[PDB]
Amino acid sequence: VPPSLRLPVIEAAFPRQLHPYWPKLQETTRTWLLEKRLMPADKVEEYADGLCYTDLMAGYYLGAPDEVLQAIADYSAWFFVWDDRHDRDIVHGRAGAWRRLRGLLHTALDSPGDHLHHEDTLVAGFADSVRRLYAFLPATWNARFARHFHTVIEAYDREFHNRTRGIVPGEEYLELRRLTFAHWIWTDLLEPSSGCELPDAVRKHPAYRRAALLSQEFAAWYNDLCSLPKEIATLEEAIGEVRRRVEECITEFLAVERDALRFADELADGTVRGKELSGAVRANVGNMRNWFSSVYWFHHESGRY
Numbered sequence: 243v244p245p246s247l248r249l250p251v252i253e254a255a256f257p258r259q260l261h262p263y264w265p266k267l268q269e270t271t272r273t274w275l276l277e278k279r280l281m282p283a284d285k286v287e288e289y290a291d292g293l294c295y296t297d298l299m300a301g302y303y304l305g306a307p308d309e310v311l312q313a314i315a316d317y318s319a320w321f322f323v324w325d326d327r328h329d330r331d332i333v334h335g336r337a338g339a340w341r342r343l344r345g346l347l348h349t350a351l352d353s354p355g356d357h358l359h360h361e362d363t364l365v366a367g368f369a370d371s372v373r374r375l376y377a378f379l380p381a382t383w384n385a386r387f388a389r390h391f392h393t394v395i396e397a398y399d400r401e402f403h404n405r406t407r408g409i410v411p412g413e414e415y416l417e418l419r420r421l422t423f424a425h426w427i428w429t430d431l432l433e434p435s436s437g438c439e440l441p442d443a444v445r446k447h448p449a450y451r452r453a454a455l456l457s458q459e460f461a462a463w464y465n466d467l468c469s470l471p472k473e474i475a476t477l478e479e480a481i482g483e484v485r486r487r488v489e490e491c492i493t494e495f496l497a498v499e500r501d502a503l504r505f506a507d508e509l510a511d512g513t514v515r516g517k518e519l520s521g522a523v524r525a526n527v528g529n530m531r532n533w534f535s536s537v538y539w540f541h542h543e544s545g546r547y
């Protein structure tokens with residue numbers, strides 16, 4: 243990894259983790275992509291061939307039930323397809339087609355059941371992915387996921403118009419840039435991964451919230467850092483500033499992580515409920531931590547494509 247991009251702290255203090263179910267994700271996701279006809283057989287094969295977003299997810303949502311990880315993996319593959327459609331609409335100036343897709347996604351997000359077989363396979367695949375994600379936790383969690391994802395769709399829309407007018411956001415085979423738009427969604431998905439919808443009071447506790455924010459912000463700043471040196475294909479001090487912000491996300495997270503785990507201790511009051519909430523907080527925070535190493539190494543490995 244380039245010295246300019248290297249993070250000795252991540253390498254030393256954030257050991258990579260891999261979900262035990264990882265080996266089984268590939269074939270299932272391939273089957274799903276082909277079944278929903280999300281991409282032509284050959285495009286599926288390319289995406290399924292090497293590194294893909296499932297690898298990011300499998301180093302992140304540790305402890306997730308197998309079915310939850312599978313659902314998240316398929317959702318991440320859907321993201322790849324959406325990104326491709328997004329780019330294509332932009333390149334071809336298909337403003338109408340994009341606007342209509344934007345509308346259908348908002349609609350399918352709130353009502354996936356009656357969109358499972360939409361003529362647009364991207365929408366059909368989206369609806370199925372969301373339906374499956376909605377099957378794990380109570381409707382209150384589903385509604386929050388939806389609330390957050392509506393915002394993500396609008397972020398893509400903003401980008402569509404920016405890029406349509408010559409503004410270059412950041413090509414990259416397996417970019418993380420647009421994925422960071424879904425920062426609240428990744429945070430939401432920690433919950434079905436530990437099997438509990440956290441009460442507002444717990445997930446809005448300052449230590450939990452801050453840990454969650456910093457985990458995601460790290461990836462945003464780091465994506466900035468990795469983009470700068472590509473300018474070649476002032477600079478040194480521009481990198482310097484972004485680098486300090488990346489390092490600050492990490493050290494700030496380490497501090498708030500300690501606070502979050504103390505909070506978890508407090509939740510474990512001896513009752514089964516306390517034990518469940520405590521365990522879920524610890525698992526979620528642990529995965530907020532795993533995000534650092536998963537992102538860091540995913541970027542490095544993606545550079546081989």
Ligand SMILES: [Cl-]
Pocket residue numbers: 268271272289290294319
């Ligand atoms: Cl795949």
Ligand SMILES: [Cl-]
Pocket residue numbers: 418461464465468537541
């Ligand atoms: Cl990145």
Ligand SMILES: [Cl-]
Pocket residue numbers: 487488490491
């Ligand atoms: Cl910062």
Ligand SMILES: [Hg+2]
Pocket residue numbers: 268271289290293294295296319
């Ligand atoms: Hg894949």
Ligand SMILES: [Hg+2]
Pocket residue numbers: 437438439440518519522
């Ligand atoms: Hg719970």
Ligand SMILES: [Hg+2]
Pocket residue numbers: 464465466467468541
């Ligand atoms: Hg990066």
Ligand SMILES: [Hg+2]
Pocket residue numbers: 459460463487488490491492
């Ligand atoms: Hg930061």
Ligand code: NA
Pocket residue numbers: 425426429454455458
């Ligand atoms: Na966030």
